[PDB]
Structures are given as structure tokens and as C-alpha cells.
Amino acid sequence: ILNLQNNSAKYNEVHRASGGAIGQYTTVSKLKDIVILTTDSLKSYLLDTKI
Amino acid sequence: GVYKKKISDINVLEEKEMRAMLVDYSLNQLSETNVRKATSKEDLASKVFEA
Amino acid sequence: ANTFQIAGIDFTDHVISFDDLGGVFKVTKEFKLQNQDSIDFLRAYGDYQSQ
Amino acid sequence: MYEGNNMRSMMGTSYEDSRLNKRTELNENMSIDTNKSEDSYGVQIHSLSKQSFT
Amino acid sequence: MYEGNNMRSMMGTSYEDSRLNKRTELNENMSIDTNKSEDSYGVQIHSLSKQSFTG
């Protein structure tokens, strides 16, 4: 999550899109926009072990 | 005293019989998608926390 | 106890807990009463109707 | 462009998009009110109620 | 609905209800104010009283 909110051409898959094979596309994310997706078991493993 | 024990035994038999009924329900009544398999008492606390 | 910040996590308010989860008995095969000490043992707990 | 008389039967009025009646809305809250275990600590033990049915 | 008399000792005025006294309740508190393990942390002994318990 600390990677994604830097100015980088990485971390996207715009090379799978049409014109994105050559050239560059840099982007960021706002951290009010990133959401993560796991199980509820890993949610429990957060809420009991680390935090 | 015999009157108060003849009302207290009502309480203890009612809680014991109803405890018996939901434990008896917790065997041989509900299917394998409900039941999960733990292994220890130092397990089954994480497993109830994800449960 | 052994962990540090669980300020909304401690779910102990929903824990109905007993010393042992069984003292009860269920008949599955049917029969008749023949022993006299069995009658005395039943009415030792108050089952006077049993002959 | 075509004028005609665009008022017609239920299919003639459907293409100007009949009114949004129900909303398949989230009033029962998933992942806000529910999917929480962040609200449990205090020692005020077993004060829970069985509601009635309908 | 039917008016009748409604009167007998039992099965009239005894068939539909009786006087209620007590529903075999929790007054001695199990798992609310007793079944406690939530006690204090400090200097210690003598929270141990004795009644006569003769009745």
C-alpha cells in the first residue's frame, strides 16, 4: 500500500491494453481509493495476531 | 426449605434438559458444512474467532 | 491476557459455558423394567410412579 | 428526429425508460453494521434479548 | 362467546387461568452478576463472610 501511492509506471497492466505495448503510463493511488480483498479467516488473523 | 428445594430443582432440571437438547442437536442433526474440525484448546480460539 | 490492544475484540459477553457438557441419557432401544433395585434407584431421585 | 406519434402502448413508452420503482437497496447493512467484531470489550456479561417473530 | 355460568371450583374459573405467583426465575444471578471471574487487583485477604445459616 506504500508502494502504490508513488509516481510509478509499474503496478498496472496497461501493456495488456491496446496501445500500451510500447510507451509508458505512470499513475498513483490515493489510499482513500485502495481496498483490499481477502478471506474472513485472514481478516481474523489480522485482528487477533498483529493489531 | 423443602418448598424452596422443590422450586430450585425445577430450575436445575430445566437448564440441564435444555442444555442437553442443544448439545444433542449439536450431534447427529446438522450437516458437515456446518461443523468444522479443530485440534486443540490452543486451537479453536482462533477458529472460533474466525467462526 | 497475553496480548496488548483488544479494546473492541474481547467477545466474552456471548459465552454461555458449563463445567461439563453432559449428564444426560437418552433411550434408543425399548424395554421393560424388571429389577427392584432399579425401582429404588429411580425413586431415589423421586421417580415414584415407576413400577 | 422521426416524429410520428412516439406515445404508443407499453412497448412504445418503454424506450423512454419507465420509472425506476425499486432500488435493490442496501438498508440492512453488510460490511458496515455487520461484518464487525470491533465492538466487544466491557464486563457487562450476557445482556442479550430474543426478539419475537412476525 | 357462550355466556353460560362459567362457574365451578375447578374447570370453571380454573380452566382458563389461575393465580400466578412465580415462574421459577433467575433471582440468584447465574452469568450476569455472579458466575464472576472479574475481580480486583491489589492488596488482599478477607472478603470471606460467614452467616449463621441456621434457616
- Please report, for residues A5, A7, A8, the alpha-carbon distance to residue A14 in angstroms, rounded to integers and kept in the order given: 17, 15, 13
- Distance of residue B24 Cα from the nearest chain A Cα, in angstroms: 28
- Distance of residue D37 Cα from the nearest chain A Cα, in angstroms: 9
C-alpha span between B14 and A22 (Å, rounded): 77
In which element (H, E) is residue C38 found? helix C36-44
C-alpha span between C4 and C7 (Å, rounded): 9
C-alpha span between A8 and B4 (Å, rounded): 79
Backbone angles phi, psi at E48, to 5 degrees: -135, 90
C-alpha span between A37 and D31 (Å, rounded): 13
C-alpha span between E53 and C46 (Å, rounded): 26
Burial B19-35 (b: 16+ CB within 10 A, else e): bbeeeeeeeeeeeeeee
Secondary structure of residue A14 in the 3-state scheme: coil
Q: What is the sign of the dihedral through the CA atoms of E7, E9, E12 and E17? A: positive
User: Would you say A30 and A5 are in contact if contact means Cβ atoms under 8 Å apart?
Assistant: yes
User: Would you say E20 and E14 are in contact if contact means Cβ atoms under 8 Å apart?
Assistant: no
Secondary structure of residue E15 in the 3-state scheme: coil
Q: Taking CA atoms, what residue in A is nearest to D35? A: A40
Q: Taking CA atoms, what residue in D is nearest to E33? A: D45
C-alpha span between A19 and D1 (Å, rounded): 37
Q: Which residues contact D7 (CB under 8 A, 6 or more apart)?
A: D13
- The DSSP secondary-structure symbol of A40 reads H
C-alpha span between C41 and C33 (Å, rounded): 12
User: Would you say E55 and B4 are in contact if contact means Cβ atoms under 8 Å apart?
Assistant: no
Residue for cell digits 453432559?
Answer: C22
User: Would you say D36 and E21 are in contact if contact means Cβ atoms under 8 Å apart?
Assistant: no
Radius of gyration of chain C (CA): 22
C-alpha span between C5 and C1 (Å, rounded): 10
List of chains touching C (3+ CB pairs within 8 A) = A, B, D
Backbone angles phi, psi at B26, to 5 degrees: -75, -10
C-alpha span between D54 and E44 (Å, rounded): 53
To what resolution in angstroms was this structure determined?
Answer: 3.8
Nearest to A51, CA basis, from D31, D37, C41, E40:
D37
